[PDB]
Design a protein around this ligand. Structure first.
Ligand SMILES: O[C@H]1CCCC[C@@H]1O
Ligand SMILES: O[C@H]1CCCC[C@@H]1O
Lengths: 118, 118
């Protein structure tokens, strides 16, 4: 595990906190999140708002990471998220790839590719 | 145009209002919206909240409908939406298929399939 992979794994562990204020601490000011293929959330504040909005409708009940690696400095990690819809109580399992760019220990770019098959 | 197709076309015309309170008038209490493959918004109130949340981050600047038809009572309609992200001012064109179920002139189900290719 490289230092960047370590940080990404810590962030993955933290997802089940469902706490945007806690999670945003991993991000640089100059950052972005893109949930493919939607337009990105530009800047740290937009990323925080995106997470906070998500946690008003879903709980991340569990994250099971099954792969992590790096190529050309970018960290690639794959997991299944157990997502529970708060207004219904129904739970869903979905696989997702996260691709992370870090600069001096902070996340400067995050791209997610969720499984979009039915 | 069947009576149901006419209603769906009125609804499509109304999208550029960016007004969830106006748009929800087309929906029955017993309704749902599913933006595929995400979990559905169950019930009229959830549909309204979904639209209202969307309009806080995007403007639908234009809708160009290029197909409408019906099969087995369901209305199928395809369009390109011009979506402008309010926090950035940037605009995006995206194709989408909407499938509508109507009961007594009100929408009881709505499924969207947006183009999810990069
Ligand atoms: O990976 C995260 C990305 C943002 C919301 C929940 C998901 O599990
Ligand atoms: O057609 C789209 C336009 C943007 C809001 C939701 C709807 O499904």
């Amino acid at each position: 595990s490289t230092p960047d992979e370590k940080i990404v794994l810590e962030f993955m562990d933290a997802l089940t906190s469902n706490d945007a204020a806690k999670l945003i601490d991993y991000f640089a000011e100059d950052t972005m999140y893109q949930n493919m293929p939607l337009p990105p959330a530009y800047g740290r504040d937009a990323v925080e708002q995106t997470l906070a909005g998500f946690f008003k409708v879903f709980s991340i009940d569990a994250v099971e990471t099954f792969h992590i690696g790096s190529t050309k400095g970018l960290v690639y990690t794959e997991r299944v998220d157990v997502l529970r819809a708060l207004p219904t109580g129904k739970s869903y399992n979905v696989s997702v790839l996260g691709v992370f760019q870090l600069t001096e220990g902070k996340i400067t770019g995050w791209r997610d590719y969720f499984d979009l098959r039915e």
